[PDB]
Ligand binder design. Structure first.
Ligand SMILES: CC(C)(CO)[C@@H](O)C(=O)NCCC(=O)O
Ligand SMILES: CC(C)(CO)[C@@H](O)C(=O)NCCC(=O)O
Lengths: 307, 307
């Protein structure tokens, strides 16, 4: 039974670190992890370092591929100070830790030798404004494929990967739970662009950003564990983000553990689980590398696409 | 407005032939074209030669990419007499000429310098036997995604691309309109494998053969023209394939131009058009190179994916 994938346990995967240096301190790591995340420097060494190696081995090889098409076309040469940007997709369910995984990865690749311009963009900013969502009757579908301005998103990544000087992306506010009027994240010809979002690995009747990814990550975990992380993180936010009177969810701060648990579960039941099951998980088979986490948040199993 | 594609008219595309030699005679070409096809040596020079170049430029570059992952993994070296097979997908509607396009391409790549083992496989053989189709009530859905043993198909391509020594594929009979009992096409570690079929470019909830393609072709034409080619070819077959008393469609041989036209159109209307519109055409955006044909069958426009 041949397979396009090859599996690894942490032991087998850490050995592939070779002599990749760790350019991240305990403090720096901290300002990168999210509430609830258990990621430590050891996990960054045994897991994120090999990955950082594999990515660098493929950034060069991926360039030969575009070089070929350039040659074929009898095109210039591609200023070495402006090669074709390596796009990386990071996917997974809400609360599975993917935003941390992305932030940490950007940190490791930025500290690679020639100091690459490694930008990071969350699909958060490509969600339709609340007003527009209400219009489409989608206010209770945030995160589902249809609640994002997919065309704009694709326009953005195509722009960057096609060598444009700069490209803009809207910015989403978690505090206000809506797109921020007039706010934009400018990305200027990075060497690497990481795109993090729920369905970035999705495929369809049109060319999508998944078709432009040169490498993709899917952070995974048993669904039940993710719900616990979700609920738990919800309760913890009563004294962090919800505490802020400006917060759209401020009314949640005064909930009892019990009341809050009921609320979190309902949201999970009606929005996040469905989206995970119907849209996110079906895209897992296509990811270059899947990071599997045990109930403790620890990455103890990995699946790589060798084909 | 940046784009992942770059378009060409025949004039611009022929210039990319450079000094690629034509190793195909008038006779040889003939035994490769299908009834109704208007392909001549000129079209092979101005269109198939550049393509043969682009493919060879990418076969090398595509190998660097697998080489990287091999290095990363600290794997052997890959016997140069056994590198990772370059898979090519050729898609398009029934009667658009794709089978010819595939056969011609195999001919050109086989006559490349080091004489590569270039195998060709049609998804014909992965259709469920008529008995099995009747069971699933699919006898009038031949060609639709669900009428193929998709799992077996994927098993086959995965086997070949993963370096297996040999892999078997069932053989379909057009004469009998069913799978041939006990017949098999053996493919032994080719250097290049071309897969031709209606929906080979299809994508889904599982890893599919489109995910294993290193390069893909989509033969295209206005839908109305394809119907005319289809109908026309149907009538012409009254004196070729349908003439054979063994032919499952022998009853069609005695049809009048009028009767046959009515029959062809009904089949097109109920089976081939729907499948083209619902399943085949939505996969066009993902093809590396689209070959567009005018009402005369002539390829006068091409769209390449540079991203
Ligand atoms: C997890 C995100 C950030 C998805 O964008 C969050 O906006 C979400 O899933 N909201 C669902 C609707 C709600 O929170 O009531
Ligand atoms: C074009 C093919 C070869 C598709 O496999 C042919 O088997 C087909 O589309 N048949 C449809 C059913 C029929 O011909 O009545």
């Amino acid at each position: 039974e041949p397979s396009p994938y090859v599996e690894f346990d942490r032991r087998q995967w850490r050995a592939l670190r070779m002599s990749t240096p760790l350019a991240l301190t305990e403090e720096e790591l901290v300002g990168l992890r999210g509430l609830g995340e258990q990621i430590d420097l050891l996990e960054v060494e045994e897991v994120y370092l090999p990955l950082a190696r594999l990515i660098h081995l493929q950034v060069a090889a991926r360039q030969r591929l575009f070089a070929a098409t350039a040659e074929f076309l009898g095109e210039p040469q591609q200023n070495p100070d402006r090669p074709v940007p390596f796009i990386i997709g990071v996917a997974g369910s809400v609360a599975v830790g993917k935003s941390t995984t992305a932030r940490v990865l950007q940190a490791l690749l930025a500290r690679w030798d020639h100091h690459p311009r490694v930008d990071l963009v969350t699909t958060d900013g490509f969600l339709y404004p609340n007003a527009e969502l209400q219009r489409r009757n989608l206010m209770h579908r945030k995160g589902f494929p249809e609640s994002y301005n997919r065309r704009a998103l694709m326009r953005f990544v195509t722009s960057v990967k096609s060598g444009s000087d700069y490209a803009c992306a809207p910015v989403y506010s978690h505090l206000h739970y809506d797109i921020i009027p007039g706010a934009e994240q400018v990305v200027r010809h990075p060497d690497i662009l990481i795109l993090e979002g729920l369905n970035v690995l999705q495929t369809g009747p049109t060319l999508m950003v998944s078709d432009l990814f040169d490498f993709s990550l899917y952070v995974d975990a048993r669904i039940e564990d993710i719900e616990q992380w979700y609920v738990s993180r919800f309760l913890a936010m009563r004294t962090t983000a919800f505490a802020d009177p400006e917060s759209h969810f401020h009314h949640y701060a005064a909930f009892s553990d019990s009341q809050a648990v009921v609320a979190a579960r309902e949201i999970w039941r009606t929005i996040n689980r469905p989206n995970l099951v119907e849209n996110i998980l079906p895209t897992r088979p296509r990811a270059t590398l899947v990071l599997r986490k045990d109930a403790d948040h620890s990455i103890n199993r990995l699946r790589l696409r060798k084909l």
